[PDB]
GROMACS .gro file of C-alpha atoms in nm:
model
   18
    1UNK     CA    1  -0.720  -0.548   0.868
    2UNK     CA    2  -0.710  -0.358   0.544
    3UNK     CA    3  -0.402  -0.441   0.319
    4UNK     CA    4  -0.353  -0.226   0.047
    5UNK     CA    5  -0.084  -0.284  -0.193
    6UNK     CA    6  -0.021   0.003  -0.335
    7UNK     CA    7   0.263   0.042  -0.636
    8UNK     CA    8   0.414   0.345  -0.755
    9UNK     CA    9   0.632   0.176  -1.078
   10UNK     CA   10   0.832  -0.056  -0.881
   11UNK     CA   11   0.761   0.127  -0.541
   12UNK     CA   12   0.578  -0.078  -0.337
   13UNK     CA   13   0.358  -0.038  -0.056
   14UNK     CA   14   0.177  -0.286   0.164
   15UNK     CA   15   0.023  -0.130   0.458
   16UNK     CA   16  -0.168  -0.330   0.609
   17UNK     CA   17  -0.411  -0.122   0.844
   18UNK     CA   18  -0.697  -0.225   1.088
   0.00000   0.00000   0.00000
């Protein structure tokens, strides 16, 4: 249930978890 969004300079990263 927990997205985090994260972003490395371009790289994102949703994960959205439990």
């Amino acid at each position: 249930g927990v997205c985090r969004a994260v972003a490395r300079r371009g790289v994102a990263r949703a994960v959205c978890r439990r």
